[PDB]
Automatic annotation (TrEMBL), chain A:
Keywords for this protein: Ribonucleoprotein, Ribosomal protein, RNA-binding, rRNA-binding
HAMAP family reported for this sequence: Ribosomal_uS15_B
Assembly and binders: Part of the 30S ribosomal subunit. Forms a bridge to the 50S subunit in the 70S ribosome, contacting the 23S rRNA.
Function statement: Forms an intersubunit bridge (bridge B4) with the 23S rRNA of the 50S subunit in the ribosome. One of the primary rRNA binding proteins, it binds directly to 16S rRNA where it helps nucleate assembly of the platform of the 30S subunit by binding and bridging several RNA helices of the 16S rRNA.
Membrane-spanning residues: none
Gene Ontology biological-process entries: translation
Superkingdom in the source lineage: Bacteria
Record's protein name: Small ribosomal subunit protein uS15
Pfam family, one: Ribosomal_S15
Automatic annotation (TrEMBL), chain B:
Keywords from the named record: Ribonucleoprotein, Ribosomal protein, RNA-binding, rRNA-binding
Pfam family, one: Ribosomal_S6
Lineage: Bacteria, Bacillati, Bacillota, Bacilli, Bacillales
NCBIfam families (UniProt xref): S6
HAMAP family membership: Ribosomal_bS6 (MF_00360)
Domain of life the protein comes from: Bacteria
This protein's name: Small ribosomal subunit protein bS6
A GO MF label: structural constituent of ribosome
GO biological process annotation, one example: translation
Organism, scientific name: Staphylococcus schweitzeri
From TrEMBL, chain C:
GO cellular component, one term: ribosome
Signal peptide location: none
Lineage: superkingdom: Bacteria
GO molecular function: rRNA binding; structural constituent of ribosome
Organism: Staphylococcus schweitzeri
Gene, per the UniProt record: rpsH
Descriptive protein name: Small ribosomal subunit protein uS8
Amino acid sequence: AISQERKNEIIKEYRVHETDTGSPEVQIAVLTAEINAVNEHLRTHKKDHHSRRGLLKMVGRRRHLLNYLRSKDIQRYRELIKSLGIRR
Amino acid sequence: MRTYEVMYIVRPNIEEDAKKALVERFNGILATEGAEVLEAKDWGKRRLAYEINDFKDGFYNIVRVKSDNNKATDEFQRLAKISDDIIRYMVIRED
Amino acid sequence: MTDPIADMLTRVRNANMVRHEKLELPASNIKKEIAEILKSEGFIKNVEYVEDDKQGVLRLFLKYGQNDERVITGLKRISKPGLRVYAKASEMPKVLNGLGIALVSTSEGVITDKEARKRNVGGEIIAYVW
RNA sequence: CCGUCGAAGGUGGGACAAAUGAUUGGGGUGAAGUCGUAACAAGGUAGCCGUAUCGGAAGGUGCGGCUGGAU
RNA sequence: GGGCGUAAAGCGCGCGUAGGCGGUUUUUUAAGUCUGAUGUGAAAGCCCACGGCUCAACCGUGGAGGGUCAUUGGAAACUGGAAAACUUGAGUGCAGAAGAGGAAAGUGGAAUUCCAUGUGUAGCGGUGAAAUGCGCAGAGAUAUGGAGGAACACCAGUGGCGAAGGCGACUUUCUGGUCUGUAACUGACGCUGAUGUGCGAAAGCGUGGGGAUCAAACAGGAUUAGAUACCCUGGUAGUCCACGCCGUAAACGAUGAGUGCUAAGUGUUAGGGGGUGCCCCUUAGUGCUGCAGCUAACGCAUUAAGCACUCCGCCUGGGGAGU
RNA sequence: UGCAUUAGCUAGUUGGUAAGGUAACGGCUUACCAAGGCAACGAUGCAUAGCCGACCUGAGAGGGUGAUCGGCCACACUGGA
């Protein structure tokens, strides 16, 4: 999808001083952008069915990260919804 | 992932106005859904070591185009065969 | 790890068949006295003390005879996760009337079956590693 | 006196049941009286799956499949 | 007291979350294993005894007596669900080579038919024994030539195969995409898988077009104590292209399913190092090579059904019944 | 009790408070109140049976679980006020 330095501005401004990836709020944000980044490739490539399930698996792994966000995060749960473009 | 080095040559007799619209279409199929290129150039008056189709000149505009969707070096190859706009191109798969 | 003593039961048994003096059972937080509960008699011989770091690996130090004679004729699993075999004041078993030590833990930590009926409790013996 | 509700009934169409004739089938039967190797070895055509077909009982000239072929 | 193979057992369904269930280090505030209010603790209840009827029904013991009615409030480094963190082995496939994911093809020249005019008149379609075909008022044979088809012999390879699925008279398209030695990039590990799109040789489906050396049937030719068969033949259909669509298989050789390890490899099409291909190259897309242990046996083992990782799962009256 | 040879059901379904009067609050009606919501807990259909204290039972692991004889729950040609 987006290049390492072409989508590192989101992490840096949303992560703590560490300059690295793997954070639950960083992974969810970097995965949501990937879906929107591969959204243009989901149009033309609609005849194929070996990548449509791939996004579902990506959302499935994101569920676990979102499950920890519903644990004890109230202000950190709406921070990745009012800033980006999603539901809830 | 799959980088491509396209070195296409334009016709020796083409107006700059049409040349701008000619490179616009080539760059449009190269910088489609993300450019991710290195640096663009614009070679002018020069002589080629090898001769192809016994021409007189030929404008140059070879630019590195790294891709991951593998759709930048697609139409380009077909453009330098069907239509009479490109003569000598390139198809390097080296990173 | 899905089963606590998963490799533990597939180690000593396999080491008692191929005659393995030193064993390498993945030590855990309760995989210490559960694999050395027969240190009183001689079934699993004995060991100095589980020495490693944050659940690394624990040995069993098995011993055999002159022509490699195994005292244990294959060890099977009985008290595992899920079900609970709590022996209360119902009925305590008996065979040779005292010999080795088993799995009877209450509030005294790791005790033998000699006073098992005296305490009238039957739990699972466990211990931490280092 | 206007009214309020009630059983009960005429029954409305349907389902439901049971015989009845005519039927269309089962599930064997009257024991090779009706015809025949309908298949298995190297089974006058060497072996065998779904099918257009498909018989008083018995299959194959098509349709794609088969070594499960011997000296 | 059931298999994940002959038994009682291969979902062809390759692409997907039924919350049934599939390592994530450390780490948590106490889901938890064994202690705690006990008075009550009774009973056509097995009452520890308790009453005799000879063969029958002769009934008091609530504390004993269980058939009570102390089992933590509790000791967290831990079924499926993990924040700080890096890794290659897999992601596109990081560098590879044959794939051109794919040639339908005009000038084309080689044909069963008429005829210009020829292997041009016995030449061919032509039989387990069994060939039918080419005027009777006027009649084929193809070295050719004035013709080809569904146009095309060789580059179509134990190819890359990504799902049952490998391309042309050279020839062009990169179309997700799958792989062995290698990790550039964040980091985090399941069920041939609930979306089995109902994909799915085959006759039938959107056969546009289709029927020609031909070829079921049909003229037939043939036996011996037995064969309209089949064989071949003039001879309709029968086989053919984009255009909702089209579905059983020897999809599984009757043979689908996450294991490894106590012999070596790991080929294929042809591409690769340690550095010269002499020592190395674990192995996968693919062909799999037997030994510990099972299975009643048969048989699974560098890709067991021993034993540590998923839902599944099949035999139930033989039957009847696939009706 | 299950249906494969049926796979769904409640709408004042789900909760709101006020006209009364009985062993009682009162979605009883009271003013008004939702969309596919309820429901898998097959609610909603059936099956229909008087319920229990009991006697055989695998050796125990499994499994049965009512003739007795008493409690209760019924019924009194058929309904109805």
